[PDB]
A paper describes a structure:
Omniligase-1 is a broadly applicable enzyme for peptide bond formation between an activated acyl donor peptide and a non-protected acyl acceptor peptide. The enzyme is derived from an earlier subtilisin variant called peptiligase by several rounds of protein engineering aimed at increasing synthetic yields and substrate range. Mutation A225N in the S1′ pocket and F189W of the S2′ pocket increased the synthesis to hydrolysis (S/H) ratio and overall coupling efficiency, whereas the I107V mutation was added to S4 pocket to increase the reaction rate. The final omniligase variants appeared to have a very broad substrate range, coupling more than 250 peptides in a 400-member library of acyl acceptors, as indicated by a high-throughput FRET assay.
Inspection of the crystal contacts of Pre-1, Pre-2 and Pre-3 revealed that at position F189 (S2′ pocket) the enzymes in crystal form A as well as in crystal form B have close contact (3.7 Å) with Asn109 of a symmetry-related molecule. A Trp instead of a Phe at position 189 would be too close to this Asn (2.0 Å W189-CD1 to ND1 or OD1 of N109) which cannot adopt a different conformation because of steric hindrance. The different crystal forms show the flexibility of the active site of peptiligases. For instance, His217 is present in two distinct conformations, one pointing into the active site while in the other conformation the sidechain of His217 is facing the solvent. In conclusion, the [name] + [name] mutations in Oml-1 increase the P1′ tolerance due to an enlarged S1′ cavity that arises when His217 rotates towards the solvent. The effect of all possible mutations on folding stability (ΔΔGfold) was modeled both using the Pre-2 X-ray structure, that carries an Ala at position 225, and the Pre-3 structure, which features Asn225. In an Ala225 template (Pre-2) clearly more strain was visible on both Val68 and Asn225 than when examining the Asn225 template (Pre-3).
Author numbering: 1 to 75, 85 to 278
Amino acid sequence: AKCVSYGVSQIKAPALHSQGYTGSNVKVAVIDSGIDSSHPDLNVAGGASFVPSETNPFQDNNSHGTHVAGTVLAVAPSASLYAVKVLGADGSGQYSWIINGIEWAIANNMDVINMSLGGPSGSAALKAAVDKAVASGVVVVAAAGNSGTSGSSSTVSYPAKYPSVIAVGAVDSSNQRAPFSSVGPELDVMAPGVSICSTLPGNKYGAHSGTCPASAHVAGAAALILSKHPNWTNTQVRSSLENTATKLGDSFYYGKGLINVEAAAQHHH
């Protein structure tokens, strides 16, 4: 909203805005470090903390949750944000806390989960939680990871690496893969993730780079699509994003390409 960012244009969100679609009546769980709910540029509808040492989901001592929140609303100005705090100030959290956050999002009928986070290692418990959210009809979006490349090996973080999740990589303003953006066959789509200006705690603004801001754009895009097509299943929202992406190169690096929310929101299934 208040900090200008190229990313909103890049994914063609203004075309939805000009049609009157802004993500009205869409519940988006920001599963991250909290959201600074006292930021004048944010509104938070509810939330929960699962970080025993950081009990307030409506404060953010990391900054990532608040930056994600601002990007979600820049793309989908009318979206209802829920602050699901599973990470501490150092941007780390236990998988069990993450799972508790996912469980809360399912129980509270979230339309979209955004997981601005990933760990290097697998968990059947984490996989069961995202698979359950998808089975319950939630669109589950996650940052692909900031682990760069590892030759022919996947560097996609968990839970982005699970097939049920939409794994989002990062491009710059000229649609080139960001050097940090994780790669592999599990990568699904790309979005803007380089020098993204958004809300920071304490009524501040600033640029962040990562798959974290990239995932935020796709969570917002899912909210725009649901506002035009509130009857679409998560399966149909996901298909619309993947099948209408702008091809950018080899899928190992770029998945299906850059999301195009204008194209996605008029996809015929």
